Amino acid sequence: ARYIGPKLKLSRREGTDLGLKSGVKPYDVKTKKAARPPGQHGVSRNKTSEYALQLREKQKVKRIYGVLERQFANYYKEAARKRGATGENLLAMLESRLDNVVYRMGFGSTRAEARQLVSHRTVMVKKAGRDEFVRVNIPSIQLQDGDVIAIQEKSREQLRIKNAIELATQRGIPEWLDVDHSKLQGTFKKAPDRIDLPAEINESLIVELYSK
Template sequence: MARNLAPKCKQCRREGEKLFLKGEKCFTDKCAIERRNYPPGQHGQKKGRLSDYGGQLREKQKVKKIYGILEKQFRNIYKLADKERGITGDNLLQLLESRLDNVVYHMGFGSSRSEARQIVRHNSILVNGHKVNIPSYLVNVGDAVEIDKNAKNQLRIKSSIETANNRNFPSWIDVNVNEMKGIYKMKPERSDLPASINESLIIELYSK
């Protein structure tokens, strides 16, 4: 499967904010944004003005990097969001948050979305008691997501869930740390999601 292989810290610097692509490192002073908060490259410190289209494109690229998906997948999610009732921008973010790799990340089973995606692909996740190894699988409200018994002793999973427990879990999921199991209670409200994302720019871009 195609992947974005660009260095993760450079991706954050390009967008000018933390995208939390490196797990625990993003919460320390070793984070690249803390040390060099400007785009990479020899012209990175030069300030330029973006056109309306440039701003829309930049926002779309940022969200794709946050959720670790490429253009074809992102466009398909937009089409689903556009067909659903309600506000398309809210629908888009809720669908992105409902992806299995993202749910696994928020439940603390992976320290980053890329690690959570790897855990899913390695057959370490059960959804309602059945193994699911497709990161793009959309989790429904009420679904139970848990670590397979054969993977519960993995040190990276144990370490990740302990760290996540210390930071608290999002309100739309319920996690039992001891059993390494969680429930996707509800779709997140827009107010629960990052305010730095301007989904309206993405909708404007795709609506042209």
């Protein structure tokens, strides 16, 4: 499954912009309500507890990338087992998802529209070492060091892809990704480092929550 309902009341529950709306308007203009959480009361009394800043920090990362709990608790299980820091191996698995990468590269206005491109067989992946361009319809493919992404010839004249590039340039392009607008082709050169993503996400709260 995936979350279908309104997107600007997710951000509002987190208290920050989640990039769930393409950046044609400022975040405080698309919703204009983003001071109070959604619903009747929203901004009120009661002192939030340690568990609440843990749940809300993990709910936020899940909402950013669009991954549900069962697929996201498997990621933490891969990141714990894996050598090195858990909360940084987790942020790499989520940034190495094929549906996330065709949005960091500029073919999707937002991850939900980049999820709609990978799933609808409009994005080809080529594993580094192999020479064929397989078509894929699995958003959760973990890219590796050297994988090359390319848009399908049938859907290379997409009117929604063409403006997703325009709008990405303002947002910028990461350094661990090499994009080619003319050839509608990219390259997952490297998994992103911890200091290449926003410092407002506190991954230490995520690892803290998955230990009861």
